[PDB]
Design an enzyme around this catalytic site. Structure first.
Site, short mmCIF file in Angstrom:
data_model
loop_
_atom_site.label_atom_id
_atom_site.label_comp_id
_atom_site.label_asym_id
_atom_site.label_seq_id
_atom_site.Cartn_x
_atom_site.Cartn_y
_atom_site.Cartn_z
N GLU A 1 -4.80 0.16 2.75
CA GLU A 1 -3.48 0.54 3.23
C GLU A 1 -2.82 -0.59 4.01
OE1 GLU A 1 -3.73 3.26 6.52
OE2 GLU A 1 -2.11 4.52 5.73
N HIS B 1 -9.81 6.33 8.16
CA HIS B 1 -8.44 6.56 7.71
C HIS B 1 -8.02 8.01 8.02
CE1 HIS B 1 -4.89 6.13 5.20
NE2 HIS B 1 -5.34 6.93 4.26
N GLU C 1 -5.71 10.16 7.34
CA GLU C 1 -5.40 11.05 6.23
C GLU C 1 -6.58 11.57 5.40
OE1 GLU C 1 -3.92 8.41 7.29
OE2 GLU C 1 -1.79 8.28 6.79
C1 LIG Z 1 -6.78 4.48 11.95
AS1 LIG Z 1 -5.35 4.91 10.69
C2 LIG Z 1 -3.97 6.08 11.47
O1 LIG Z 1 -4.62 3.48 10.01
O2 LIG Z 1 -6.07 5.81 9.38
MN LIG Z 2 -5.15 4.52 7.63
ZN LIG Z 3 -5.80 1.64 10.00
#
Ligand SMILES: C[As](C)(=O)[O-]
Ligand SMILES: [Mn+2]
Ligand SMILES: [Zn+2]
Ligand SMILES: C[As](C)(=O)[O-]
Ligand SMILES: C[As](C)(=O)[O-]
Ligand SMILES: C[As](C)(=O)[O-]
Ligand SMILES: C[As](C)(=O)[O-]
Ligand SMILES: C[As](C)(=O)[O-]
Ligand SMILES: [Mn+2]
Ligand SMILES: [Mn+2]
Ligand SMILES: [Mn+2]
Ligand SMILES: [Mn+2]
Ligand SMILES: [Mn+2]
Ligand SMILES: [Zn+2]
Ligand SMILES: [Zn+2]
Ligand SMILES: [Zn+2]
Ligand SMILES: [Zn+2]
Ligand SMILES: [Zn+2]
Lengths: 256, 258, 257, 257, 257, 257
Positions: B33, B119, B121
């Protein structure tokens, strides 16, 4: 770095914006590889080849699929071994399908799927077909995919004679054998312990398969042939032939 | 070869550990991501894996290969799935992958698993995978397989720590995507994959109490970050790391007794 | 009566299964183009014919064959862009196999031979087997045994190969609508073959990789991967006996009375 | 006649959508244990009651609410080991949301508000939305807009929180069958709440991780995560008006004439 | 403490099931157009009301009715091209029924009556039951019993039919929004029926086959397959009592204390 | 010369489809017990035999029939507890139909007649059609027309039924291995029928509801729902000609050039 995971999204975007950017996806497995090698070999090898090929022809490498389809007796020893952790076919197919759909969303249109686990082949194929079907539904028909198993580029008789001086029996028995062990010795020697190699006769099977898998039909150590004669030298030869052949194919299929 | 990482072990080394009796396996679950103009995109894989490695070394557990792809990035937590680079899986795929792995670990004879999410999500799809797997195990006659699920960041709640991390005032993990928290950890673990000079010191992102689909790009800060990593540092990362590692190690010790 | 389960009454079938060591066979084919000289149900007809003969010889029963199989691949069947070829998605084929095994288990059957007649079906048949056996385990059934094979793999003897390809064998790699299948058809269904329509083109050669979407230019126009010009009824009769005998012995070995 | 689609004839519905700017609302709840003091259909009753009032104010329509939601989680709903709680697998809930959106798009509708009343439903509703929107894109429809929300998220005003929790606010974290939902029920369905049955216990506290299979010993015996002793009809009316006004305003903002 | 599970606390529900011979009922309906004279939730309202009365007489409990059913078919429901009708894919309905049965078993329930109110649902309810019973078997549960029925099947007594159709009965094939359902609605939900809007068209006739995509011209304009002009509250009361008594007896016979 | 797609080369098929107006027919049957007097593939044989004759009269082509159908239900086929009967899960049958239509659409075909020969297949065939048509729409194809029918639905002429049942007609409800199918088999496949094994038991009668797990005691032991003692080749020939002419006319009307 040629690894998509080590780039920022801006760097990635710039590369895809070029219009002819090639992406590569290693598809491996977590599978037993005898008493002398680690279990992530099927991920390590295709990833190592992708890295070198991407560096050679200017492509990028996506994070590799760590888990692959169930190990088959005649090719990987069988899914009854501990350590081997396999996915159901639908899961692997859906993973490939989702990745392609996302790459298309990015604007990418060139993908090379590099398989390192024999059993993954047809599920990768189905994932490709299903993704392409959806892309067509989304009005996209200029996305091209090349799929291959890196060992298929080692067909030259001269090369094979160098790897198997005593004689060649085929790739059928090449699970944790001379081929893979040689590559590992050339790439990750600290993950190979040749003194642990069980030098047993090559596995032989009738022209059919039996289920549930019968443990008695696979050599005890899990390998289908002995890696006794493996060497870093054979590994470097194999590596160069594969990197060379694959880089060439990509240049032919995905010209700048 | 002896290592905390299962992928680096031969099947005999793995078999020997499981045969030991109460072997604990850990499985990092991340994502590919976007993480702003200053960090790489595999952060969600790198961080939980680094924590797992250290915990495993301290309590004698083993770490499974991490899941590299996660669920679709959400606007309020990861910026949104409209960004390039972010490569997400459908929920069914992630759930099925988790389900399959648990089914296999059970077959091996393992009965203790720690799923460490990196992550945000991923959570509910990891949960469904666990439930579907436990259901099948029951059909197989197995009811002694225990699973602990956690997101490493949840172990950093000590007010004293929070104060050190955010001396200017804490706004919450709500906007911690590519912000101070993750950036600091990366500076302490993979400084080469971070370039603080590219940080965009924009104000914390705010959203209304609802979501809109299709995702509206305008509602996400241009860089992809939900907050500024301007005040991140290696020192803060080291504090966060030790806190998470010590806390998670203790959690496993309590849940998975010898 | 017949060895075909479909042609038995449920009582006759029940009596056979009651024997306790009954072997069932399931042909798995496809509807796929096979050049200008043969019909499209070749992959169903051939394994069904082999199953029929093996079953009669060893005393087994044959289940209705799966008429549709997995998507044709360029290097093995010419490609799924050809008209006529009607393929199933992998999950569909896998599920059908899984469902049939579940039902045979319910009948009390415990021995099954899956005979593939379409190269591409292989791994989907394998996944159907695994998913079904997983369920049987959950049901408390662990004595169900499955043998899966593609009939052509029993034609390996060097001497036999010499009689079929006296000019030299180039592997079954290019055997789609070629000498092997056409000869079998000339020995089994000559009326569904017309050698006068054979296109004698050199064998198809491919690089060590695959391209998608399928590129029509990489498959010989007729759909065949090699020429069936030297095909004959005699060669077919030889292939047929080698297969029947070989598979029949394999079954006696794996499924003893 | 009624803001509820279920109570309309197809002609009345058609005429409403024919207007061109019709907004539809879909309540998504659950059948879940809610302590010793409240019934189990609370999660659908509440979002439906909020939708009704919002619909009456902005001129929208309300679809029949989903009665079954995702599996109850220990830290948010007590756990799925409780009797009565009847949950769907994630795929089923996602598939339902997905099917409804497809159908509404078929009707010609292009504006939907999904109002969740069961916390655990969140990500599965989101996936249902994405899969549906993907399909709509393939169908050549890209003007279908969705607003998804959980009604309790509109209660964030400090002053309002003060009147609800004058003794101090701990967060929605422990709000399952607690003061918040119980207060709403008292103001909407008082005959379905017996506050005298509330078991007063300390707020539930959990370590920063989850354990599966769910351990019944880690959930307060009654099933609630916090005491509803201070719940009242008056607090319910306050929460309700704040939510209805906030949501009606949100809809006007996202779905302007 | 009503017969509706949704209105019970989990403790009350737990107590009833603990009794040992608790019978659960699950209405399965749909959101479907029902002509110009009736609302669209008729299919869930009717079986729910019948369940309510049967439960009060035999001491059973009624689960929340499924509000969305399978796609409306032209020859039975007018067709799925109508606005308002909001249908689920078959896999979604099946999975919902499967999930619920699995959960009831977890609760300890072993007796279930599935009451269909939407003709098209039948086969998917059946598959849902089979898949669920398959899993219960794998779980070691083989004493779960299910009774499936469409409430209208209990109204076939000649003396009764004569009362409802003194001008001549043609069959339930055309009973979508017709005399039967409208009369029941007039007796249970008069406010949701506007008989004055009925279109007195002749019974719909169809060829012995179906066409897809659905052809709108083959369904009577109003959506009804027969005229409900002779529907009455009195006829509804007759149908109601007949169904209730008939179903109640069936439950006594299949689920004896 | 054959009307069977499987017996054509891809070139012949391509020519027919590209010629336009090409009607394809897909028989859908099952492997199911049909009493002590008939084989188990009846549901495949009959619709395939009808398709052949219809195709030869109107110039259509026939696709390989689906050999396995949905689970046998007690009231229509005796029940899925009988050995021999081998049934698919609903999703499997639905997916098979869906994949075939997708492929035919790829070929350029736009006309399909699904001929069902197994009662329980109906709704799953319908869902297969709907899902396929949905995808075709996504692919930009909206001119694909499908007709679905059960061949027996064309036998409803009073004069004909009087000729077939010269002692009172009870309906097709009890028609499983009865006079109807047995007569057709005597006219088409006499060698697969042995009237000397027919069990002359009274017609089956069931209560207005179903029970699961299926109760074997509620199905006539032989597996037949009615006696075929009065079956004859002459009755079969009449049925066959009536169905063939009726279906041929229906197709001419629904698929004009
Ligand atoms: C730690 As995150 C909100 O980038 O999944
Ligand atoms: Mn993430
Ligand atoms: Zn992250
Ligand atoms: C035979 As292999 C490279 O999949 O282990
Ligand atoms: C390659 As083949 C025997 O399935 O046509
Ligand atoms: C936490 As709740 C309102 O879904 O019970
Ligand atoms: C044909 As009906 C009773 O489901 O409207
Ligand atoms: C009632 As039947 C023709 O499907 O056996
Ligand atoms: Mn491998
Ligand atoms: Mn083939
Ligand atoms: Mn809830
Ligand atoms: Mn209906
Ligand atoms: Mn039948
Ligand atoms: Zn390997
Ligand atoms: Zn072939
Ligand atoms: Zn609640
Ligand atoms: Zn109705
Ligand atoms: Zn029949």
């Amino acid at each position: 770095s040629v690894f998509v995971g080590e780039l920022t999204w801006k760097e990635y975007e710039a590369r895809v914006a070029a219009g002819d950017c090639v992406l590569m996806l290693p598809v491996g497995a977590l599978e037993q590889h005898g008493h002398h090698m680690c279990m992530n070999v099927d991920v390590l090898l295709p990833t190592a080849v992708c890295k070198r090929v991407a560096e050679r022809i200017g492509a990028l490498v996506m994070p590799g699929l760590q888990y692959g389809y169930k190990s088959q007796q005649k090719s990987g020893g069988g899914n009854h071994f501990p350590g081997t952790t396999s996915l159901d076919g639908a899961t692997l197919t859906g993973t490939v399908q989702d990745i392609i759909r996302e790459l298309a969303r990015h604007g990418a249109r060139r993908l090379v799927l590099m398989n390192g686990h024999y059993e993954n082949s047809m599920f990768i194929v189905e994932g490709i077909d299903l993704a392409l079907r959806e892309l067509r539904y989304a009005g996209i028909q200029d996305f091209k995919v090349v799929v291959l198993s890196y060992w298929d580029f080692v067909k030259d008789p001269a090369v094979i004679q160098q790897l198997y001086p005593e004689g060649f029996l085929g790739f059928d028995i090449e699970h944790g054998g001379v081929f893979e062990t040689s590559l590992m010795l050339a790439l990750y020697p600290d993950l190979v312990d040749l003194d642990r190699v069980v030098d047993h006769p090559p596995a032989t099977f009738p022209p059919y398969d039996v289920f549930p898998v019968d443990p008695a039909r696979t050599p005890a150590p899990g390998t289908l042939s002995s890696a006794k004669t493996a060497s870093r030298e054979k590994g470097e030869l194999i590596l160069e032939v594969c990197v060379q052949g694959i880089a060439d194919a990509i240049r032919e299929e995905f010209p700048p």
